[PDB]
Design a protein around this ligand. Structure first.
Ligand SMILES: C[C@@H](c1cc(OCC(F)F)ccn1)n1cnc2c(N)nc(Cl)nc21
Ligand SMILES: [Mg+2]
Ligand SMILES: [Zn+2]
Length: 338
């Protein structure tokens, strides 16, 4: 409502995939998550669902955004706004709209918003090796992933001005809470192929068998019955949050390159401190004095992204992302020049 001009225009084409998140970031002065959050939450009707006022939502968006680190190149409020944008975009897709229910839409949007809150610009392994208080607290197991959700619920429920969950039913909140916790914990690296295997085997292969057999009215209910089961809806939520979290290789070229530099700069900054303090180098290839970012991005896309978005694309149909993925992959190849 009370929105300045440049920032209002910066959120013009926000249903579209080609959306300039950095123009929002620049216009908003490192506060894009509250501005993009209010519009997305209003579009998805989330406070109507949660029974909150706008004032509670504004206070909730500011306090969690405040706890994102400006110092971090990549892991800041603009990343989680970018992930919020990707999440909302996937929810808008026809497959996801008719598969998932209204409570999942709210879980995903909240989960995305908080998914890297108070990220220290460092990996879990670093925090275990460096002897961090979170590694002791979370027992070297999902250290950041547990911390993000835990802090996010510490900040939300601990103050009445921030508590967006206060006017809900107790049983509905527990269902929504478990949905958020599951999707925030689903973002960890170590369980990548665990979650991707499940998605191809549980959803795509059975769905391919159904389309292979035919496409009758009765067969359509069996496809709906299979996917809409609570077990498979969780599997889709995990694949959605994971794809949103690493959607930057599938962006318009200018955004892809910016995102690649930011995360590259983080990993170099960690590598400097690993060398400096006298720690074991968990990420040796990501050094500022030896890493080819164009080669690393090719390897990143090959090892994780391509198979993941292949499964996710088959399900949702994301031609623009795949068309952008191929274009960026060819650009990163093109920087050989000798
Ligand atoms: C956050 C970080 C990341 C993502 C990972 O993804 C593997 C799986 F989740 F897809 C694994 C480890 N770290 N990450 C996000 N975007 C990234 C990108 N373009 N390149 C790299 Cl080298 N790491 C990225
Ligand atoms: Mg994370
Ligand atoms: Zn993340």
């Amino acid at each position: 409502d009370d929105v300045p001009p440049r920032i209002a225009r910066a959120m013009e084409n926000e249903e579209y995939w080609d959306f300039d998140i950095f123009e929002l970031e620049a216009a908003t002065h490192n506060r894009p998550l509250i501005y993009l959050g209010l519009k997305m939450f209003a579009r998805f009707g989330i406070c109507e669902f949660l029974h909150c006022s706008e004032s509670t939502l504004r206070s909730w968006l500011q306090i969690i955004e405040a706890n994102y680190h400006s110092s971090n190149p990549y892991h800041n409020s603009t990343h989680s706004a970018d992930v919020l944008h990707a999440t909302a975009y996937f929810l808008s897709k026809e497959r996801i709209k008719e598969t998932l229910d209204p409570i999942d839409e709210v879980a995903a949007l909240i989960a995305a918003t908080i998914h890297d809150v108070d990220h220290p610009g460092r990996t879990n392994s670093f925090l275990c090796n460096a002897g961090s208080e979170l590694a002791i607290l979370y027992n070297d197991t999902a250290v950041l992933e547990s911390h993000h959700a835990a802090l996010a619920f510490q900040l939300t429920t601990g103050d009445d001005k921030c508590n967006i969950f206060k006017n809900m039913e107790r049983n509905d909140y527990r269902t929504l809470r478990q949905g958020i916790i599951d999707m925030v914990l689903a973002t960890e690296m170590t369980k990548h192929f665990e979650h991707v295997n499940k998605f191809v085997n549980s959803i795509n292969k059975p769905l391919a068998t159904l389309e292979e057999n035919g496409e009758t009215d009765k067969n359509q209910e069996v496809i709906n019955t299979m996917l809409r089961t609570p077990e498979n809806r969780t599997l889709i939520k995990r694949m959605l949050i994971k794809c949103a979290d690493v959607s930057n290789p599938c962006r318009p070229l200018q955004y892809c390159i910016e995102w690649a530099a930011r995360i590259s700069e983080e990993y170099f900054s960690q590598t400097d401190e690993e060398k400096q303090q006298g720690l074991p180098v968990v990420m040796p290839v990501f050094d500022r004095n030896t890493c080819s970012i164009p080669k690393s991005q090719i390897s990143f896309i090959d090892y994780f992204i391509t198979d993941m978005f292949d499964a996710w694309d088959a399900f949702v149909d994301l031609p623009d992302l795949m068309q952008h993925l191929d274009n960026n992959f060819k650009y990163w190849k093109g920087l050989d020049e000798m």
